[model samples]
Target: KTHVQLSLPVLQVRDVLVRGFGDSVEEVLSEARQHLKDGTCGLVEVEKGVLPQLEQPYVFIKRSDAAPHGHVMVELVAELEGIQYGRSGETLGVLVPHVGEIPVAYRKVLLRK
Candidate 1:
């Protein structure tokens, strides 16, 4: 098997925010800004050559009971990795693991309404 390694830019977390239904986009972003002010959060800068697909970057929030009431953690993650592929183009395996919290509403969010 040939060993191959390459750096691939994937979804990168640009910013984190806390949001609730009662909050507007501005309000949510302000919350994130406050978190940054308090040093509880920080910003992420996407390096050159790393770009998102056609979709415009956006923030997503999910309900979490463990978090403060009426608030959700907005995690912007970049899906990046290095992997080896078999001759048939199937992914042999990921050399670097992408670790993060899986969204709890994954199924529901992806569902066709």
Candidate 2:
């Protein structure tokens, strides 16, 4: 028996969205998708009590209050042209039903309008 090369979806992201794709969350995810479609597209709100100039900004579109990773994210993101912001937080754990384990994003945003 010969070993077969395992094909991997390296270039593609498999990050899933949890908490029922509705409203706010859906908004963000959709925005990300839009970025993908357009293939196109900054401010510093000081939180204080943190490292100076060392604080990495969260990866997400902005509006009122929500939030970065980078280009891969850049491509996945869709701008709503609406007010939204999550800024930065961590809870990267969303398990799909009958699914073993997978990464996920909240994919949500605020309506600054």
Candidate 3:
């Protein structure tokens, strides 16, 4: 029997945006937290070369609203395909999905617009 090895590439964060909020700090904090809890905080678009490796990259944000008049902070994390071990010693879960490759020609298009 032969075993195949797969490599998972590291991803970088290009930009971040926060949505579903009003002008008030309280409003933004509330909306952001709710989205995070529901697993829909925000969208993330990585660099050109990294998209093919990323599964469903998204923003994992947190705010300092609890601190009186503190600034807000945000972070991004990618949820790529991989193996996840289950509670049972003999249980193993695989999350390998076919990720389409990005053509070189398309790269030029992305760079232009």
Clashes in predicted model 2? 18
lDDT of each: 0.24, 0.25, 0.25
- Per-residue C-alpha lDDT of model 3 across residues 1-113, encoded as one tens digit per residue: 12111222111222222222334334444453444344333332334553444233212222212221222222212122342211112111111111232212211000000
TM-score of each model, in listed order: 0.23, 0.20, 0.24
Write down the RMSD of all candidates, one decimal each: 18.2, 17.0, 19.3
Task: Looking at model 2, report the run of 10 residues with the lowest lDDT sum.
Answer: 3-12
Q: Which of 1 and 3 is ahead in TM-score?
A: 3
Tens-place lDDT per residue, model 2, 1-113, is: 11111111111023222211224545545543333234211111224431132212122333322232221111112212343244523322111111122322223222221
**Which candidate should be chosen as best, given TM-score against the real structure?**
3
Model 2 misplaced stretches (Cα beyond 4 Å): 1-23, 42-113
Superposed by TM-score, candidate 2 places the C-alpha of residue 100 at a distance from the truth, in angstroms, of 42
What residue pairs clash in candidate 3, if any at all? Answer: none
Q: What is the RMSD, in Å, between candidate 2 and the native fold over all Cα?
A: 17.0
Residue pairs whose backbone atoms clash in candidate 1: 10-79, 11-77, 11-78, 11-79, 12-78, 13-76
Residue 38 displacement (Å), model 2: 0.8
